[PDB]
Design a protein that fits this description.
The PDB classes it as oxidoreductase. Two copies of one chain form a homodimer. The first copy, chain A, is of the alpha+beta class. Helix content of chain A is 18%, strand content 20%. Chains A and B meet through α2, β4, α5 and β8 of A and α2, β4 and β7 of B. The structure holds protoporphyrin IX containing FE (2 copies).
Chain lengths: 362, 361
């Protein structure tokens, strides 16, 4: 229930241990006033300092002027910080505004069209995003709600996604969670303690070409539907063949333990792990940080289930793009469909109480 | 960490309120009474495994390679999490299997209420399964697997996820707050109040339907909150709407959340005043609802609210009179009922040889 420090060279919510719940929102900007937008970022940063410490925004949730609406909407009163992190990102479409065209990072690449894509344009893109992660879903919603409230008239929510449970791990010492296909998901990821691997694969560096992004990262979000009727009638051997690990232990095929190293030549040529492994992609490595979702029924008598896939990397051109290109023959494709997509540049951390979100860009 | 599955009553009504909910309504696709009873027995066997934290059938792995696993496996490694599974039968079930004359009179159709805007696709249903647990993945795995076992005899009509408190971080005796920011549940029937449960919640044999003795009647309402409108209202307006202050949750004029309210000090159309038993001839409900947030609609607004669940001994003397009295609720400006269903919840599974619905079938 403890707090995650908000200040740092990097934003929390990336290398941070993966919290239980996600409320992810993408925002479109509705003002053309750069000064008004900078004021918003500063106001949002101040609110984030309160929210991530478990305090109410502004002057609080009650005890103010009776005839005024309260500063904070109040539904998190008496709750712990619950490991809340708030991570902000800037979308490519943002750089068409406030004269930022020449500051768009080269590493903020538009994604190509991939085979099988069925992207809903309404639930894709966005000028900016806020990823709210916490162990208490009420804490995460409260944070999104109050940020949106503070930004009224300057930003509007384009789309949002709740994740009811994590399907990722940045802490290999703790149990690996399972996704809705029933397999452990997160075994060979980057751990928050592997400082050298994060510098190598996750954090943007000064020499990479965009100085304001130094210490930031790049985020790919993909909303992925799972064909669970199709999956649930597949045999056990089929399911394990698709991945190359067994279902129970999550060990690489042939081996005894989850964390034994995969021997790829023992997996089928189209097994997901074989195709996604860094060794199959010239070393490309990702920090996966996704969550499961379910949005009611599909109107056809079945549950609607999916995975909200999130990957952080140092350069989208060298991370998600080559790996996803290599998944064109993935056996898993028979069971999933990508239906939403967005990329963001995640700026560096808020250094101290005088700093603010996006200060190095603006 | 686990709640007993067997008893005189089904668990999940008077037992401690868990952190998370997955509620699903199903429609029956078979005309065959024997096939439906077979499914009820199969479901009961699965619920016994699920509520003890085991996989269904022969497990999630380790069986024949060329067969699909009995359990879909996404709860492997998780704890029971206080999972309860509560089944209910909807009025439309009783048009099948020759059951028309066994529908309890207490399972009344709800009237139309002023301001209803019910989405037909998220209303009704032949039966429901209420899955409550502290871990949402344990709840979802339960519904997922019951639906899979029933495939070909039932389909899922609609599904609702909900949350309450997070118990690992919130004290047990602290009242949770709903998404309007007010404490919710102060004056409610508690599972410890055995006499009030007998009076207001459990069906009795003398009530007129013998197969329902020990059961209860459930009303579900999906209630959207107009969040953005509410958040623009003054603090005084919000407290005037309920009749309690926002910080402490105390009735107006009193000091502590649990002071008994003085109704005359509240505005005439304040929510607590209109809902109180003294304003409804003694009518008293067991509220066991959950907050929901499903996303944002097409206009950018928060799709969020209260998934209202009330248990009562007779729908005609519980939910109906109180909801009727809310016709002029000041709260109506800020909410809208958009889904509805009622269910008869049968008595409990008495022992290892009993099964869901045995008293009816
Ligand atoms: C619903 C969609 C997906 C599911 C169910 C899924 C599932 C899994 C599973 C079970 C594993 C093995 C355990 C682990 O090491 O995490 C895995 C590994 C991995 N997946 Fe996926 N995955 C999905 C989508 C993706 C996508 C879209 C990408 C990249 C574009 C990706 C990249 C990877 C990588 C890089 C690994 C680690 C491989 C290694 O280095 O051993 N996954 N995934
Ligand atoms: C979004 C919809 C609703 C919200 C936000 C809401 C909220 C509240 C709040 C804050 C209280 C005061 C604290 C408490 O005693 O729990 C309360 C009391 C109560 N509410 Fe509601 N309520 C809603 C809908 C309903 C409905 C639909 C009914 C019945 C049909 C109902 C019946 C009651 C009752 C019986 C009480 C207890 C009154 C007493 O005995 O003091 N509520 N509600």
């Amino acid at each position: 229930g403890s707090a995650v420090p908000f200040h740092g060279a990097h934003q929390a919510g990336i290398a941070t241990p993966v919290q239980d719940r996600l409320h992810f929102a993408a925002f479109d900007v509705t003002t053309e006033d750069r000064a008004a937008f900078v004021a918003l970022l500063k106001e949002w940063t101040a609110a984030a300092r309160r929210l991530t410490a478990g305090h109410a925004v502004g002057e609080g949730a009650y005890g103010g002027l009776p005839e005024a609406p309260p500063d904070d909407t109040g539904e998190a009163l008496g709750l712990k910080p619950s490991r809340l992190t708030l991570t902000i990102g800037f979308g490519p479409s943002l750089f068409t505004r406030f004269g930022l065209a020449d500051l768009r990072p080269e590493a903020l690449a538009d994604l190509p069209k991939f085979p099988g894509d069925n992207l809903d344009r309404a639930r894709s893109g966005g000028d900016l995003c806020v990823q709210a992660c916490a162990d208490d879903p009420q804490v995460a919603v409260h944070a999104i709600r109050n940020l949106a409230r503070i930004g009224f008239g300057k930003v509007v929510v384009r789309w949002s996604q709740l994740g009811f449970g994590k399907t990722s791990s940045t802490t290999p010492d703790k149990q690996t969670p399972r996704n809705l296909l029933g397999f452990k998901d997160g075994t060979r990821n980057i751990a928050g303690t592997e400082k050298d691997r994060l510098d190598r694969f996750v954090w943007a560096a000064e020499k990479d070409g965009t100085p304001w992004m130094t210490g930031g990262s790049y985020l790919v979000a993909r909303r992925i539907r799972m064909h669970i009727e199709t999956w649930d009638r597949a045999s056990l051997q089929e399911q394990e063949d698709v991945f190359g690990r067994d279902k129970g232990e999550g060990a690489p095929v042939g081996k005894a333990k989850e964390r034994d190293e995969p021997f790829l030549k023992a997996m089928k040529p189209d097994a997901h792990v074989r195709l996604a492994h860094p060794d199959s992609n010239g070393g490309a490595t990702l920090l996966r940080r996704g969550y499961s979702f379910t949005d009611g029924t599909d109107g056809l008598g079945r549950l609607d289930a999916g995975l909200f896939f999130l990957a952080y990397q140092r350069d989208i051109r060298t991370g998600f793009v080559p790996v996803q290109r290599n998944l064109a023959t993935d056996a898993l494709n028979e069971y999933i469909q990508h239906v939403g997509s967005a990329v963001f540049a995640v700026p560096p951390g808020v250094r101290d109480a005088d700093d603010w979100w996006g200060s190095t860009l603006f």
